[PDB]
Design a protein around this nucleic acid. Structure first.
Lengths: 134, 129, 225, 94, 36, 58, 92, 44, 125, 129
RNA sequence: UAAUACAGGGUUGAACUGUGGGUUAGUUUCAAUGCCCAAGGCAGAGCACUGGAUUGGAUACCCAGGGAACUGUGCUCCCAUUAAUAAGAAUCA
RNA sequence: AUAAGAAUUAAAUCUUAAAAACAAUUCGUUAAGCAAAGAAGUAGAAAAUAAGA
RNA sequence: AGUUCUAUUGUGUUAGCAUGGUUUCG
């Protein structure tokens, strides 16, 4: 009988794309360089394909060992099997860069070469002329 | 969930209090009645696509500036020929264009918007909370 | 924390930006300066792109920027007079000019319409320029009054493509001389690499828009619910 | 609805309304000649109108208040730039 | 200070002025030192 | 009583750290509160945490 | 001190990676490079000022990138300001 | 200077106590509704 | 020299706000514009002075910041209520609840009684 | 004198309903003169401070300018026929201190007494020292 | 920058006190390194200098060695001389 | 001479050498002079320094 | 603001000590 009488809309139950902490605005180029370092350290896997490197390694090992490959190439075979099972249905990511995503949140500070775009007016203006008399 | 500053002071809103709103209604009613008592007068209504699809995005007032040298030019310059009252719902967005407009402007906005951009009171003539 | 044995006091904005957590401009002090407002006049700066000034209210083939080297000027100045004594027996010798904009749908990136307009202009001895694309067309046409009227009628009624809107503007009559000498076309001559770069930038902008559009649509759905 | 509160629920107190409460008397604190708010009648200087406040300690009216009010009202009446006059009291119960 | 600091910077004082700071090339002070 | 506040001028000056490689304070230390500083309550809005010691005596 | 790791039912490469992580988070290589050569006090002042200004920015951007990755992975939508006076009542 | 006499709000409060309730603003719900109805009737 | 260092001087601009009626009356009187049809109605219903009413907004100290802390410290279980509802941030360092939360109602009633003229502790009881 | 030169700052505030200034009997007398001249809405005396409730008109404040004449490091006195010339053709208020109290330059001119020039309110651009 | 000894300053409270202050030369306590003087004198490192390279060439950058300087109630304040762009009052919740 | 150590962009000077007490690496023990690595957010009071390009 | 006391001292001078780079000894 007794129970919650309002919607479970808490942003913890329903995580939302937002920055929960603010920070003094950062120079645009400094923030861009930091984000580049983060991306390099993460090694965004946008390669030809995750399975391409495993296949190349397997083929190279087979070429190196034409006779005893059955026993030599087992770690490579297992790695390639795992890669096929995991990233077989792999699609390259299609999303905006974190730099643009944070420019959206206005994290960075306007420098001489970076300014936030002014609010759109032509696209957002909606006019409705109606008669008002009598 | 929050890791930001916690304000300690709250600002009141006298412009949008009960009695001030009642006075706004009383003063705007007389002007609207007098305007409607005269014939062949049209009223323009401006808003935002996100607060109104069906509404046309182009009208006679719109100028549609296209050149860089014309950036400073207003887009509602010619509205005075056609209209005798501009009912605005996005004063913050249209402030630069409603500034010193030669037709009366009735603006609808929130106390938060008024306090964050008090300069809209220099482009609004009549206010309806 | 570390012990640096003192602090530094740089004066320049560059070194301060490097050596401080942030150099974000703070709100003006209410006791010193007034608050910034949307009505403040913009800075008086000429709009430039890659060092070139973009100062023209209309595109036209006769738009040029002043360069650093002398260009031969006309030795003298003489403006031919405007003949105002024109009657039915002479009103056909007057010249004129207009500009047109068409919106709709055309195929082959406007090549068909370009060819049609070039043929019509060659037949009518009109001059000026035209510019056709997938969804729009613009042009500036000059010539005899009858030829201009025929061109206007052709554009309004005799175009073999979807023409949702037609507009004519900047009409003038009784001109002594014609600015142009041929009716040419403005053709997009960008390299494929340039086109690809521009398309990538446009796609970035489109994704930025789509994020907010999806958020707004979800909000509208919730409001409807 | 069972245990929680709602705005429509009768008795719902508005915290902002409670917080923004003001003392009515403090609306006339800036009304005096010397600024000590001791004069029997206090006149505020406003554009286009006159404002007179009775400021006797007990709310009683005496000759000092009579003379002050008379002079203030005559000046305001004669003044054409003051289109109307307002009369009120600064007391609590009177 | 403008012309005075200019003389200091160009080094006329370094040559012509005694210094209780001494140095192997600058003129020295043979009297007890005090701020002037 | 109506008495004006006293001046915020204090003898000695402001903290100075000796130039060079010593790290010694030529005057005052790093915990010095300038006279022109906000209140302690203003600077420390939260106040003592729940795990701080109520009595600071050692 | 010296970090000790036991290579048991794990890869020596993995254990070496864990040791490298310990060294990096303890700044061992940084201190070794610092002590290998003489650093003048003014250089140390400038370096410490630069680090104290820089690292908080890096931490904030790391948090931002973590949030971005989480939102992309979970297909989260951009938030809208919570409109007050919403009854927040169940439609039941 | 601590024996001078200057008018003070503490002195005024002490005098009154020898001899302050805050009030919330009214909402004018009915008047607001009537004015809104009149505006809607005008805009019909 | 300097620029915007003249506080109480040329840093601010003391210029009048001219509304539609004032500007149109001036234009008509000087004859730069033909009398519009709406001008009579606007004059007979002049716009109000919004700047004067704006100057009446006063900053208020938030006593709830401390009252909520007191009530929460006395009764920690109040944070369960509406724990899943967006708006109630109960994380350490915030304790910011919605106006319809029991904590907000409690502090509102306490402050109402205090305004009526009771002590903090009496209002709490 | 120092307190009056300080109160100049509190009087020259903009976009403010009221502002505080240091207390002094000379400040109280100058405020009395200002209120009698209708330049402030009012003022209140609270211990060490005085709260001046300022007056506005059409957005802008009534007090548009204050020029200090007599500073605590330099007195300025004038004979009647010098005061007349210095205040010639001006609608501003020049505050004068005399043996008859703190009055306006017009009262001083009618009385023909020697006075000390303290402040000039809304005097435009008219000063000599 | 552990403890201990001797002294400040800052913060908080109670009491006392009662315009007792803000600024400061014909004023003088302190103050990086270097230089002069005195001390010691080979933990480290290190001018001049030596010799092993690069360079048309280097009197340098690189390498090896190195008796100048590196701890003082002394002499002593030159400076990109020390918490900033002098100190105090007023305006802000 | 030579190798090894060391160093270098690469080399060289330099040290040891033929079974090793101190060239270099590993392990113990004292000895000497020397002494901010680790522990403090220039951040959050509304607290804000300089009309313009 | 100043004087006295009160709780606290990464402040300045201090006899000695724990630890440590380096060199040293086998």
């Amino acid at each position: 009988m007794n129970g919650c009488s309002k919607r479970k809309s808490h942003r913890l139950l329903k995580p939302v794309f937002e920055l929960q902490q603010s920070f003094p605005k950062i120079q645009h180029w400094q923030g861009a360089e930091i984000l580049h370092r983060l991306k390099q350290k993460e090694k965004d896997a946008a390669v030809i394909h995750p399975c391409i490197d495993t296949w190349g390694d397997y083929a190279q090992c087979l070429r190196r060992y034409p006779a005893t490959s059955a026993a030599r190439c087992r770690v490579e075979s297992d790695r390639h099997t795992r890669c096929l099972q995991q990233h077989g249905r792999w699609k390259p990511s299609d999303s905006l860069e974190a730099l643009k995503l944070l420019e959206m949140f206005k994290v960075f500070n306007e420098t001489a070469r970076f300014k936030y775009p002014p609010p759109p007016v032509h696209s957002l203006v909606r006019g409705c002329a109606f008669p008002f008399s009598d | 969930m929050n890791f930001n500053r916690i304000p300690t002071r709250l600002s009141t809103h006298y412009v949008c209090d009960p009695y001030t709103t009642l006075m706004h209604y009383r003063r705007t009613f007389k002007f609207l009645q007098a305007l409607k008592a005269k014939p062949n007068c049209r009223a323009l209504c401006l808003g935002n696509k996100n607060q109104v699809i069906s509404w046309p995005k182009h009208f006679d007032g719109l100028t549609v500036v296209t050149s860089a040298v014309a950036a400073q030019s207003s887009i509602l310059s010619s509205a005075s020929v056609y209209y005798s009252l501009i009912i605005c719902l996005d004063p913050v967005l249209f402030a630069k264009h409603l500034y010193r407009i030669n037709v009366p402007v009735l603006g609808v906005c929130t106390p938060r918007e008024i306090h964050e951009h008090p300069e809209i009171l220099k482009v609004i003539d009549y206010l309806l909370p | 924390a570390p012990f640096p044995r003192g602090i530094v006091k740089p004066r320049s904005a560059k070194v301060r930006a490097i050596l401080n957590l942030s150099v974000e401009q703070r709100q003006p002090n209410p006791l010193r300066a007034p608050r910034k407002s949307l009505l403040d006049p913009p800075p008086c700066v000429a709009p430039l792109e890659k060092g070139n000034p973009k100062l023209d209210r209309q595109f036209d083939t006769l738009n040029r920027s002043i360069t650093g080297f002398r260009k031969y000027k006309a030795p003298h100045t003489t403006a031919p007079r405007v003949v105002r004594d024109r009657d039915e027996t002479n009103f056909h010798e007057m010249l004129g000019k207009f500009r047109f904009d068409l919106q709709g749908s055309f195929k082959e990136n406007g090549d068909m319409l370009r060819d049609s307009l070039l043929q019509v202009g060659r037949d009518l001895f009109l001059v000026g320029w035209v510019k056709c694309r997938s969804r729009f067309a613009t042009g500036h046409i000059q010539g005899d009054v009858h030829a201009l009227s025929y061109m206007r009628r052709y554009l309004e009624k005799h175009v073999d493509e979807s023409v949702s809107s037609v507009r004519f503007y900047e009409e003038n009559f009784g001109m002594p001389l014609l600015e142009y000498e041929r009716l040419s076309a403005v053709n997009d001559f960008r390299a494929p690499g340039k086109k690809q770069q521009h398309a990538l930038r446009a796609a970035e902008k489109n994704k930025a828009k789509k994020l907010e559009q999806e958020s707004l649509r979800h909000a509208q759905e919730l409001e409807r619910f | 609805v069972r245990t929680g509160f709602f705005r429509t629920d009768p008795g719902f107190i508005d915290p902002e309304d409670v917080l923004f409460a003001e003392d009515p008397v403090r609306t006339w604190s800036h009304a005096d000649g010397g600024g000590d708010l001791a004069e029997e009648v206090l006149e505020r200087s406003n554009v286009g109108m006159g404002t007179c406040i009775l400021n006797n300690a007990s709310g009683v009216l005496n000759m000092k208040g009579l003379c002050g009010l008379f002079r203030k009202l005559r000046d305001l009446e004669v003044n054409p730039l003051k289109r109307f006059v307002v009369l009120t009291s600064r007391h609590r119960h009177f | 200070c403008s012309d005075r600091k200019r003389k200091i910077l160009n080094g006329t004082e370094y040559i012509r002025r005694k210094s209780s700071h001494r140095g192997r090339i600058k003129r020295g002070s043979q009297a007890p030192a005090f701020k002037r | 009583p109506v008495v004006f506040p006293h001046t915020r001028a204090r003898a000695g000056g402001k903290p100075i750290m000796m130039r060079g490689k010593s790290g010694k304070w030529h005057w005052l230390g790093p915990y010095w509160k300038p006279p022109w500083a906000p209140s302690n309550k203003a600077r420390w809005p939260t106040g003592p945490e729940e795990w701080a010691w109520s009595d600071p005596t050692r | 001190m010296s970090c000790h790791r036991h290579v048991f039912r794990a890869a020596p490469a993995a254990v070496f990676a864990s040791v490298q992580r310990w060294g990096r988070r303890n700044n061992v290589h940084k201190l070794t490079l610092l002590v290998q050569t003489y650093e003048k006090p003014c250089v140390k002042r400038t370096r410490i000022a630069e680090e104290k200004a820089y690292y908080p920015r890096w931490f904030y951007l790391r948090y931002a990138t973590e949030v971005i990755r989480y939102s992309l992975k979970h297909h989260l939508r951009l938030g809208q300001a919570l409109d007050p006076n919403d009854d927040q009542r169940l439609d039941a | 200077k601590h024996l001078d006499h200057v008018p003070t709000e503490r002195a005024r409060q002490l005098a009154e106590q020898r001899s302050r309730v805050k009030l919330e603003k009214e909402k004018f719900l009915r008047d607001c509704m009537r004015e809104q109805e009149n505006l809607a009737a005008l805009f019909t | 020299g300097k620029g915007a260092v003249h506080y109480t001087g040329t840093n601010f601009r003391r210029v009048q706000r001219l509304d539609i009626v004032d500007r149109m009356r001036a234009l008509v009187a000087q004859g730069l514009v033909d009398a519009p049809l709406w001008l009579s109605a606007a004059e007979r219903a002049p716009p109000m002075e919004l700047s004067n009413l704006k100057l009446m907004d006063r900053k208020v100290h938030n006593k709830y910041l401390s009252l909520t802390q007191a009530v929460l410290k006395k009764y920690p279980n109040m944070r369960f209520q509406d724990c899943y509802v967006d708006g109630n941030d109960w994380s350490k360092g915030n304790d910011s609840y919605r106006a319809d939360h029991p904590v907000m109602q409690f502090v509102a009633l306490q402050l109402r009684l205090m305004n009526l003229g009771l002590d903090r502790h009496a209002a709490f009881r | 004198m120092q307190r009056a030169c300080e109160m100049v700052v509190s009087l020259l505030r903009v976009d403010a309903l009221s502002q505080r200034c240091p207390f002094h009997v000379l400040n109280v007398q100058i405020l009395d003169l200002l209120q009698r001249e209708g330049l402030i809405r009012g003022f209140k005396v609270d211990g060490t401070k005085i709260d001046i409730l300022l007056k506005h008109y059409k957005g802008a404040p009534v007090i548009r300018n204050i020029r200090v004449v007599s500073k605590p490091s330099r007195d300025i006195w004038l004979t009647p026929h010098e005061l007349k010339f210095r205040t010639r053709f001006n609608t501003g208020l020049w505050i004068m201190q005399t043996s008859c109290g703190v009055i306006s330059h017009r009262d001083c001119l009618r009385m023909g007494i020697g006075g000390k020039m303290l402040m000039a309110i809304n005097n435009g651009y008219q000063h000599f020292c």
